Write a protein that binds this DNA or RNA. Structure first.
Ligand SMILES: [Mg+2]
Length: 792
RNA sequence: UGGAGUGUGA
């Protein structure tokens, strides 16, 4: 069947007005038609095909096209308002390479279907009409800019400037039409991406290396880095007077020119000298940025909400959609004002802390609170602990003092940290991590009469490198320990807030919890606390662009303690490259008969063992989907859940509520009045816990926008929750309030988070599991670690 | 790796 229809509109919270970045578009009625494109020989170059089509149009616009102006998608589809006076005619295009183009009328799209879908009278989205409108709107943007997909950004509009290590950053908008509740919306939003500067090869190499290589040949690592950076760069020769030929470069010779600047190897297309070549403008940097040039872009793309709103308004008026021939002929009419969306600021929930404290309750003012005069619900009275000093700057006395300070902070925050460790702290070196870990574990087990450790405070260096991952992998797949790796800078500079955050982390890293909603304690949460429910969360973390070697990791967590649900236990796996499903939610093989598996079954069994009873309802929070596979993901990951529940106990099919969360979109909400105190306590974003479900949401399906976090800088992007499946029959107010309330139960922070802790923990587990691989099956987690939040 | 929050809808 189709998705879950929207049951209604929310009412809770104080009314307020925000401004979205969606611009109303009025659909035309011109009987738009699509004409197929066939070019022989076949070339997969979108720019070349577009140029060929443009030349064909210029040649034969008044010949047999009837003065009708086509709109070409770029690869295979051509759209024209009305109907051309011909059906199947072929035109020859000579660029002098010659091409043969075949054009045939395919079918006629229906704008009335788009109107019916936007009016809420059906549930099927006319992808054809939406794509035709998008392409006819973006023809002029493609012509005037450099397309990178749905974003057309070019220089001389924001003065692109230096980024770091050669490549720079460009600025511009992101345009994508979308069918919303109020009608078609042009989702214009500012965007930026990295570009390679048109610099000579010598200058670019010097900037990337940050030094001079006039007389120093490159090392193996330097050569590998140069090849990785330069793989896929177009360069043009400049030594010739009037030969503007281009030579794509992917391989570099291993020998110098003599075997000018002939010492260094010359690029191979013969052997093109690297001293008389220039990088072609417009190239895009692949892979991912480094830690130094990511922040340089962050200082560019991170601007105030008012500045971003003004930039979007300026960009929309700069395109002038009311003047371009494509939209004038096609009947398009785009507005130039931000939608005045009404919102609702949901109230913050009451948090209950331990009775043994001055403050037994807390009301988060602006989405963040403090632990002063409060104690955790559950201390864990850690008794056995040890420390490893993987650093040389810090001394034994300094490390012992840091441990004592952390313990005192834990005790005053509500723990019972042991004053003295099992074994005296000793300093090792960051290369013998395995030997140090086995030595510490074996010594601790030899002492304390064969009782395992409960914690391991590790002071690893600032830029350790290949050390944190190895340490965590060994401790969580070969030893079975719990570690609290810290950095040397914070050990040297002790701050009470840092100690409190570390205490909050190590409380939940050893069982128990530190804060609970009063509604959860009082068994008063709508449609949750009435009967036991297990709240799941999934996330699939794909590797860095082209990384076939490394597989993709999927993680699934689930709440484990009922009456005050805060404790999530998760499992991880490794599946095929760039796979958008989770093949390990259920697995059946032959073993004498057919023993089952998967993560759903294991987590349900763990929940049953932990709380004494099987869960009665399920609330699934999926993440990491790309909007192109909702149907497939829902079908597979709901059939897997049903089969896992059936296999565990017969006739056990609890209701499920499949909700997909994703923050990767370009829907921004701005404060209606920037001169008023209705925004965050800073000079920035809108108030936390504000819900939007009108005028920018799906016309018929069930979704909402929730900005539950207090943005610290830049324009905070609210999360998007889409309820694909709903068997509990959640009301709009109930689901919005529940999702907002969970955001206040994050273990590691004393603030409200943007996405739900289920999905956030699933993402953290998936990101952490990348350190375990060293083949399709990941190493098995130890049995003393899977029951505790090792990832937090 | 104290933490939340800021850049890509494959
Ligand atoms: Mg994720």
């Amino acid at each position: 069947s189709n998705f879950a229809p929207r049951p209604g509109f929310g009412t809770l919270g104080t009314k307020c007005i925000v401004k979205a970045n969606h611009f109303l578009a009025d659909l035309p009625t011109k009987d738009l038609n699509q004409y197929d494109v066939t070019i022989t020989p076949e070339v997969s170059s979108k720019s070349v095909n577009r140029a060929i089509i443009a030349e064909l149009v210029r040649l034969y616009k008044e010949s047999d096209l009837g003065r009708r102006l086509p709109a070409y998608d770029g690869r295979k589809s051509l759209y024209t308002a009305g109907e051309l006076p011909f059906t199947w005619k072929e035109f020859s295009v000579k660029i002098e390479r010659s091409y043969k183009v075949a054009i045939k009328f395919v079918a006629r799209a229906n704008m009335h279907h788009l109107g019916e879908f936007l009016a809420g009278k059906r549930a099927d989205c006319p992808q054809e009409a939406v794509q035709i409108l998008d392409i006819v709107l973006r023809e002029l943007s493609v012509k005037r800019f450099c397309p990178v997909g749905r974003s057309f950004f070019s220089p001389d509009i924001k003065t692109p400037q230096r980024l770091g290590e050669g490549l720079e950053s460009w600025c511009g908008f992101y345009q994508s039409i979308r069918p919303t509740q109020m009608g078609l919306s042009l989702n214009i939003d500012m965007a930026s991406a990295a570009f390679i500067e048109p610099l000579p090869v010598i200058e670019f190499v010097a900037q990337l290396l940050g030094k001079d290589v006039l007389s120093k040949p490159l090392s193996d690592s330097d050569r590998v880095k140069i090849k990785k950076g330069l793989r896929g760069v177009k360069v043009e020769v400049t030594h010739r007077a009037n030969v503007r030929r281009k030579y794509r470069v992917a391989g570099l010779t291993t020998q110098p020119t003599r075997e000018q600047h002939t010492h260094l190897p010359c690029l191979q297309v013969s052997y093109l000298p690297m001293e008389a070549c220039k990088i072609v403008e417009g190239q895009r940097y692949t892979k991912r940025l480094n830690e130094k040039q990511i922040t340089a872009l962050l200082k560019v793309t991170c601007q105030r909400p008012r500045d971003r709103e003004n930039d979007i308004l300026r960009t929309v008026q700069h395109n002038a959609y009311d003047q371009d021939p494509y939209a004038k002929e096609f009947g398009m009419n785009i507005s130039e004002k931000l939608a005045s969306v009404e919102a609702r600021i949901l109230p913050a929930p009451w948090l209950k802390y331990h009775e043994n404290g001055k403050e037994k309750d807390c009301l988060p003012q602006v989405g963040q609170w403090n632990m002063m005069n409060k104690k955790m619900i559950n201390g864990m009275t850690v008794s056995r602990w040890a420390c490893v000093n993987f650093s040389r700057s810090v001394q034994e006395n300094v490390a012992r003092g840091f441990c004592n300070e952390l313990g005192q902070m834990c005790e005053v925050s509500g723990m019972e940290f042991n004053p003295e460790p099992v074994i005296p702290i000793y300093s090792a070196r960051p290369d013998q991590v395995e030997k140090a870990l086995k030595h510490v574990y074996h010594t601790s087990m030899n002492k304390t009469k064969g009782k395992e450790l409960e914690l391991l405070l590790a002071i690893l260096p600032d830029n350790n490198g290949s050390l944190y991952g190895d340490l965590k992998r060994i401790c969580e797949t070969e030893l079975g320990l719990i570690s609290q790796c810290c950095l040397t800078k914070h050990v040297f500079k002790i701050s009470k807030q840092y100690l409190a955050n570390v205490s909050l982390k190590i409380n939940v890293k050893m069982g128990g919890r530190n804060t609970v909603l009063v509604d959860a304690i009082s068994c008063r949460i709508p449609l949750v606390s009435d009967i036991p429910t297990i709240i799941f969360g999934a996330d699939v973390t794909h590797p860095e662009n082209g990384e076939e070697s490394s597989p993709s990791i999927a993680a699934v967590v689930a709440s484990q303690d009922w009456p005050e649900v805060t404790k999530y236990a998760g499992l991880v796996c490794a599946q095929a490259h760039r796979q958008e499903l989770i093949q390990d939610l259920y697995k059946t093989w032959q073993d004498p008969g057919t023993v089952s598996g998967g993560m759903i079954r294991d987590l349900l069994i763990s929940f049953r063992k932990a709380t004494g009873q099987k869960p009665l309802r399920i609330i699934f929070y999926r993440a990491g989907v790309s909007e192109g596979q909702f149907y497939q993901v829902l079908l597979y990951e709901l059939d897997a859940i049903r089969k896992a529940c059936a296999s565990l106990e017969p006739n056990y099919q609890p209701p499920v509520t499949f909700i997909v969360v994703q923050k990767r979109h370009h829907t921004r909400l701005f404060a209606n009045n920037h001169r008023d105190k209705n925004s965050t306590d800073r000079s920035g974003n809108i108030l936390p816990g504000t819900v939007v479900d009108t005028k920018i949401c799906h016309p018929t399906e069930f979704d909402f926008y929730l900005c539950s976090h207090a943005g610290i800088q830049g324009t905070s992007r609210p999360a998007h929750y889409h309820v694909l499946w709903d068997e509990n029959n959640f009301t709009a107010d109930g689901i919005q309030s529940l999702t907002n309330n969970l955001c206040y139960t994050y273990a590691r922070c004393t603030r409200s988070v943007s996405i739900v802790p289920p999905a956030y923990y699933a993402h953290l587990a998936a990101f952490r599991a990348r350190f375990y691989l060293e083949v399709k099956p990941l190493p098995a987690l130890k049995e003393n670690v899977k029951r505790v939040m090792f990832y937090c």
